[PDB]
Structure formats: structure tokens, C-alpha cells
């Protein structure tokens, strides 16, 4: 009963913070339910997985993750539209009907991968540098890590696609719009603008000419590009349509080249303003799974690389 | 117990999860505040459990649902908290600390009164007394919480030019009289229908807001007289529906604690009133 009351109280605790909009003073100076849920999902990931060293994830930790995510996603079971079939039947909303199970499957793939850290990990830490045995890893460990890396590579890519898709369906706040420069030229700057409006264009060649050396330089570029697209989409026609398309092409290259880039000013604006509870759960859950899969991928990459140095050293 | 513990955890998740949508099941957040959603859910739970209410015990199955679902609707208030000296401590907010326990008590007395169904007459008399205690105690809490809730701008924008315009010339002339007795005031008016009583309350509550937002001595007297009349109406007509200022405050309130307090106290007042009224029928049918 005590362990039982404690369980009920835990659920009550979680749903109260949500219903309060995070405002524990009571008087709803809080956030919307949609933002509360968005925040809760990202908070839970930070609590379960932390900053992520590659480490064992014991079964009890997998259990907290599973149930707490269950609680947070369960609202989506109640998000409904009516569809013809002659009758009108209630059906889960079309943007969640397959997306939610698709996300839960990526989640399970990720956990199943992290579960394989329960064995003998031959690497250790002293970002903390990772080391492997002087001879390098044993072959069974090397093969496990490659498989694990393949698995999280898959999750990262599928969750990034779901994330990008949901953000594309979320409304742009008037607050973002009023902040926009007057011009695509004004948001890009004169040098970048000239390049993107060139008669002949290769987005790979466009980016090689740029200083992309820091995470902050890339995010800056992304922010200017996204602004210019909003500016152009609201505004020659043939030619506006071309620059828009080239911009969207660069935005797609950035996601591939830089999967761990922070969220853009537009992303954050959409999230803060969004009142749609389904999209909030979609956006936050996909982002969380993409981000964890990316971090795990990179960390495994760190170990396999230093293993490559050791086999050359030995 | 394992499967029985699983079933309740699931049922409670469902109700909570549903409330996050603020009654907008399309999921677009088109939706009401969590405070109003919680207010309504308490209202609709009571109507489902009790409906219109003869004088019998509540079925065991309904008692258990009532208990369970009110436990869950109230639980949010456990987390409404403030910093106070005692060292500093974190404590349940002062308007909830004693009031929520007090209301749960009144709830239990109500259910007990119904459980207890010619010194038939003496029993029945006993029952009216303790349900009368409940009606008045719940009403005091309800009235107190409403006095602490913010008046919406929409209500203010709706207001007449002044207190005379709001009351009508005849009622304004009576309330501003040089001597005044509220009992005698009311005795001259046509109080023969619910709308007539309700329209009076609404007109009087509007004058109070008009006067308070604006001789100073005179307006303060008039305001005070208005208030004594509203106290008399509460006691003469315990079954009176909510005023438009009441309804406006509820629709607009974002405070979760006050929402739960107002709604729970309100359903307990009216439940109490109905059981009182239903006992009065048998006692009159007796006479």
C-alpha cells in the first residue's frame, strides 16, 4: 500500500504540475497545457539520460522512462477527429494516428540499444576523454558497438524527419513576424544574398565559401535563412520561388551536416506559442529521441575512433 | 490487489490526460484554462453522481466513484504552496490549507445523512438540522472564495453608466433613502419568481462594482446597504442560481485553487439544499 500510495502520488505529482502550467503558486501565471507537456517531455529526458559518457541503463531506469513517457503521451489517445465510413466514426487525429506509434517504436529501438551497455564495456573515461585497451577492443565488443551505432543512426534520422515535419505544420507567431527584417536581402546580408541569387547555384559550393567553423556561425546562418524564407513566402515571382527553394535546400543540408545544432529562433518561437497539445507532444518527443540518438551515435563514434588509433598503435 | 491497483492508476491517468485538453478534444487547444476545466469537471461529476436526488442511501458503487474521482480532482490542490516563516517552510496555500479539509468533512456528513435512510419526525428533524449546517457552511466558503476572485474586464465593460441606471429609479430611490431597513426594502418588491430575485441580485451586484470603482460617505453607505441586502437574499433564497458576476468570475478565473474551492463548495451547497428541500416535502406532506 505504501509503495502503492507512493506510485499514485507520483502520477498525481506529474499531472498536477501539468494542470498548474508549472505555476506552483496556484493562480495560473503558468504556461499552456501544450507548453507544459512539451517541457515535461524534455525535462524527463534530461532527468533519465542526463548529459550523456556511455553508461549502463539498468532495468529499473528503463521502467521509469517507459511509464513516465506513457503518462505524458496518454493525452494523445484523447485527441480525436470524426471521419466518414454510412456513419461518422471517431478516430485518432491523422497527424498522431501513425506518428505516435512510429515514435514509440524508435523509442524502443533506442532503449534496446542502450540495454546492450549492461555487458562488459572495455572502454572507460578519465568531454572526458575515452580510452580503450592498449591492443584495442576485442572483436565482439567492436561488432556490438558498430551494430549499436547503426541502430541509433537509424533512430536519429527517422526522428529528425518526424521533428522537422511537425515543426513545418506549426503556426508562426506574430511576435516572430513583427521581428523580421524588411527584406530577404536585409536578413541574409549582401554577400550571402548575392550568392543565393546567383544564376547558377550548388548548395554545397554555397556552404564551402562560408565560415562554418563554430556551432554559433552555423546557427546564425540557419536563422537568417529561415527568416528570409518567411519573408519571401509572405511577399519577380518565378524568382522568389527559386530563392525560397534554394534556401530550403540549404536548410536540408544543414540538418544532415549538423544534426546536433541547437533549435533555431523560429523553432523556439513556434514551440513557445503553440497551443496544440498533439503537436507539442509530437515535436517534443521526436526532438528528445533524435537528440539522444545523436548523442549516443557521437559517443560510440568517439570510442570506435580511439579504437582505430589503438590498432594502429599496436 | 495488483490488477486492482493497475485499473485505478489507468482510470486516473485517463481523467487527468483528458483535462489537459481543456475540453477541446480536437487537440488544437481551442480550449478552456485548466482552472475552468477542473471547475466544470467537479460540477459534471456531481450531476452524474447525484443528479436530481428521493431520500435514500447512495448506492455503494456510486459512493466509491464519488470518493475516488473527488480524491483525484482535489489532489492538484496539494501542490499549491507558498513560503512562510516557522526557518522558512513550504506550506499549502492559506486559502486551501483549512478550507479543503473543511469541505471534505461537509461532503462526508452529506453522504452520512443519506446513509441514515414516528419519532420518524425526530430523526427527520435531526437530518434537516445537520444538512442545514452543511448548506450554510458550504455557502460561506463559496461566498468567501468568490469575493477573492478577480472581476473580468468583460464584466466591467458591460456595466451601466451609474448606480441609478443599474438599479432603476425606484430601487435607487429606496436604497438611497435617508432611513433604511433591508427587510422592508425587500418586502415592497415583487419577489415572486426566481428571475425577479436573480435580476435584483444582478442589479445590486453591478451597483456595488460601479460604486467601488468610482459624496464618498454616501456611496460607502449605499454600498454597505447593498451588501446587507445581498446577505438577506442568500438566506431567504438558498436555492437561487448563480449571479452573472459569479458566472463571469468563474469563466475568467485562471487560479486552480480558487476554481476547485468554488466548484466543490458550490456543489456541496446545492446538494445540501436539495436534501433539505426534499426533507421539507415529507414534513409538509406530513402536515
From Swiss-Prot, chain B:
Subcellular localization(s) per the UniProt record: Cell membrane
Protein name: Rho guanine nucleotide exchange factor 8
Full-protein interval shown: 78 to 431 of 523
Disulphide bridges, residue numbers: none
Gene Ontology molecular function terms on file: guanyl-nucleotide exchange factor activity; identical protein binding
Tissues in which the UniProt entry reports expression: Expressed in pollen grains and pollen tubes.
Gene Ontology CC, one term: plasma membrane
Function: Guanine-nucleotide exchange factor (GEF) that acts as an activator of Rop (Rho of plants) GTPases by promoting the exchange of GDP for GTP. Active as homodimer.
Subunit and partners: Homodimer. The homodimer interacts with ARAC5/ROP4. Interacts with ARAC11/ROP1 and ARAC10/ROP11. Interacts with PRK6.
Domain notes: The PRONE (plant-specific Rop nucleotide exchanger) domain is responsible for the GEF activity.
UniProtKB keywords: Cell membrane, Guanine-nucleotide releasing factor, Membrane
Main localization category: membrane
Protein source organism: Arabidopsis thaliana (Mouse-ear cress)
Domain (PRONE) ranges: 1-287
